[PDB]
Design a protein around this nucleic acid. Sequence first.
DNA 1: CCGACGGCGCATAGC
DNA 2: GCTAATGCGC
DNA 3: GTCGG
Length: 327
Amino acid sequence: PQETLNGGITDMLTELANFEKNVSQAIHKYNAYRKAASVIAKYPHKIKSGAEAKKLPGVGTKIAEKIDEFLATGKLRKLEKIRQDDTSSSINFLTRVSGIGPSAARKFVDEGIKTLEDLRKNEDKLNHHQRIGLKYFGDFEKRIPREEMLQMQDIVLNEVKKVDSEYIATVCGSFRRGAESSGDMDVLLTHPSFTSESQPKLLHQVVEQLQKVHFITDTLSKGETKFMGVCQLPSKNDEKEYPHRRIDIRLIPKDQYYCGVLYFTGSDIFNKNMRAHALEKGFTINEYTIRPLGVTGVAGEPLPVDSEKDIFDYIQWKYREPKDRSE
DNA sequence: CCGACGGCGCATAGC
DNA sequence: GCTAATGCGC
DNA sequence: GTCGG
Ligand code: NA
Ligand code: NA
Ligand code: NA
C-alpha cells in the first residue's frame, strides 16, 4: 500500500471516525470507520467502485455508498455539513487536548470555551492533566523519530539500573518492532520482588530517580502500578530544545511480564492472529497469562512464563522476532 | 433481528 | 469520610 | 457501521 492510493477515501473515513468519537460520542461507530479506514489503506489498487470496496471486511453498505459519492463528486455532503456547523468543529478541536474527552469538550464549548486562547484564559476550569495537556498541545501532536527513542530508551534503562540491579525494563509499541517513528514511549517494568501473590515503592522509586535526572518533567497520573507523564531529552546547550514527549511506565508482576511485553509490543493485528492461533491449539492468551483450555472451553491455571519465547513454545509456534510482527 | 464491539488504572456525586 | 460510577487514555 | 450468531 502507499497511503497515496486511496488517500482521499481514508482521510474521509478518518474524518467521520473522530466525528463519531468526539462529537456524537458513538465510540463503536468510531472504531468501525477506523477498521474501515485501515483496511482500505492496505489495499494495493485505486478503488473504483463502492462495491469493489465492500468486498473488504469492515467496509459495508453505507461506507461503500459514501465511497461512491466521494469518487462521483469529490466530497461528502455529510462531511461538508459537519465541517461548517461550528459546534462540531470546536468540540473536535478541543479533544486534541490530552485530558479533554468528548464530555469536557462538549461542556467547554457549551459555555463558550472553544479555542486554546479560551482555554488558557480559564486554566482554573481545567484539572491537572488538562493543564499539562494544554501546556504541551503542540509537542504532543509531534512524532518521535526512532533515533530519539533510542537515546530515550537509553536514559530510562540506564537510570533504572542505577536504582535496583534486578529491575528489568522494556520499551515496546512500534519501537520494539523497528518502527522509524513512535507516538510516545511505553515502558514495561518488573522486579523479582513482585508476584501475583505479592513493595509499593517499586514504581515510585524509578519515577523519583527519573525526576532527578531532570528527564521526567510532569506527571499526568501516578499510582502503584501505572504512571503517565512527560519526559524530555536533554539539549546540549546548543539552542535547540527537544520537544516534550509522552511517556507511560507500567509495573507488572514478573510472572505476567512477558505476556505484558508480548501484548504491548503487539502489533494489534498480530495479537488477534496469535491469540486465535493459540486458541485453536488448546491455550488462550491475554495481557497477563497463557492458560490451557479443557475439552469444555474452560481454562486451567496459568502456565509459567520466563521468556517471551516460552509463549510460542506452548502454542507450537516459532519465535517471531518483533520486526516481523506487523501482522 | 439484534446484541457486541476491550477492559482497566488513575483522577475526580452520592451517601 | 467512604464507596462506587464515570471520564479519560491507552 | 459492520459483523455474525
Ligand atoms: Na464487507
Ligand atoms: Na483529548
Ligand atoms: Na483525541
